């Protein structure tokens, strides 16, 4: 179950600033513990304001991309927010389609993100054209995943496929069909 992987439950996305919050989490994903990280990103925390500021960087880049008729405006915006945070894209953004069961999707994504040292900003493309950003960082055998709507989750690299499948099923159960997942592999 998804709750089995939960280490710090916290819905910190009431203000719809997911990309910004996810990037802020990436910046300090190794600081303190899961609980303190969620306290940082919570509404009365500095992280909520910093995340909002980062989300504005995302929005600014998106607005410019759309105005310039960019071929991939969302890829451009996501790249802008992670670069603003001091990261650089390590690979071309990868798109994993939901073709097949959620286990397959979870497995493919896990193979890409659950590798020691890798960090990612991920975008969930809800069939209803709506997007949602989350982030993850793999520290040795420890895989950490943060979803602004839910909080922080952790698993061994071995169980990452189960954790990701759980997240996908969570959204599908709420009628937010995850058509695909875009991966933004980053490094400092």
């Amino acid at each position: 179950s998804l709750s089995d992987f939960s280490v710090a439950s916290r819905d910190v996305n009431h203000n719809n600033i997911c990309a910004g919050l996810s990037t802020e989490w990436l910046v300090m994903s190794s600081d303190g513990d899961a609980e303190s990280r969620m306290d940082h990103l919570d509404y009365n925390g500095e992280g909520q304001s910093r995340g909002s500021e980062r989300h504005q960087v995302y929005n600014d880049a998106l607005r410019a991309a759309l105005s310039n008729d960019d071929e991939a405006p969302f890829f451009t915006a996501s790249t802008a927010v992670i670069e603003d945070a001091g990261f650089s894209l390590r690979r071309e953004p990868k798109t994993v389609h939901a073709s097949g069961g959620s286990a397959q999707l979870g497995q493919t994504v896990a193979h890409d993100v659950a590798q020691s040292g890798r960090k990612h900003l991920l975008s969930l493309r809800f069939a209803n054209v709506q997007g949602h950003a989350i982030a993850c960082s793999c520290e040795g055998s420890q895989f950490k995943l943060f979803d602004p709507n839910l909080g922080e989750f952790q698993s061994s690299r071995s169980a990452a496929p189960q954790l990701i499948k759980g997240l996908i099923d969570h959204y599908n159960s709420l009628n937010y069909d995850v058509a695909c997942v875009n991966e933004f592999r980053v490094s400092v």
Side-chain angles (χ1 to χ4, degrees), residues 57-62 64-70 72-74:
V57 172
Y58 173 84
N59 288 335
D60 290 349
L62 179 57
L66 293 174
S67 179
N68 295 166
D69 297 303
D70 189 313
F74 298 98

Side-chain angles (χ1 to χ4, degrees), residues 43-62 64-70 72-124 126-127 129-161 163-187:
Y43 307 105
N44 70 332
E46 173 68 7
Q48 177 75 195
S49 279
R50 196 70 189 71
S52 180
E53 294 183 57
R54 295 189 191 286
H55 202 70
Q56 294 199 319
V57 172
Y58 173 84
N59 288 335
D60 290 349
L62 179 57
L66 293 174
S67 179
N68 295 166
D69 297 303
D70 189 313
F74 298 98
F75 279 11
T76 296
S78 291
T79 298
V81 70
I82 65 89
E83 295 190 327
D84 174 70
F87 300 105
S88 58
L89 272 180
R90 290 294 71 181
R91 291 284 193 297
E92 174 61 43
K94 180 179 178 180
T95 301
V96 183
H97 300 82
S99 61
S102 59
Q104 183 183 303
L105 175 55
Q107 177 58 61
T108 300
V109 175
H111 176 64
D112 300 322
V113 309
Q115 304 290 170
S116 189
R118 296 192 182 182
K119 285 192 176 66
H120 293 258
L121 172 66
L122 304 175
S123 54
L124 304 182
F126 297 149
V129 307
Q130 176 182 174
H132 179 59
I134 62 177
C136 59
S137 177
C138 195
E139 289 173 44
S141 177
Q142 176 183 48
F143 177 66
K144 301 178 178 178
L145 183 150
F146 166 66
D147 181 332
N149 291 326
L150 304 164
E152 191 174 315
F153 302 81
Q154 285 180 27
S155 74
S156 59
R157 301 200 305 253
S158 302
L163 168 45
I164 300 175
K165 179 181 187 299
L167 194 63
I168 297 299
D169 294 332
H170 168 76
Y171 284 102
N172 295 325
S173 74
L174 294 173
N175 304 314
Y176 288 83
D177 176 55
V178 183
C180 69
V181 175
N182 303 301
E183 309 171 354
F184 298 91
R185 185 176 168 181
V186 307
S187 69

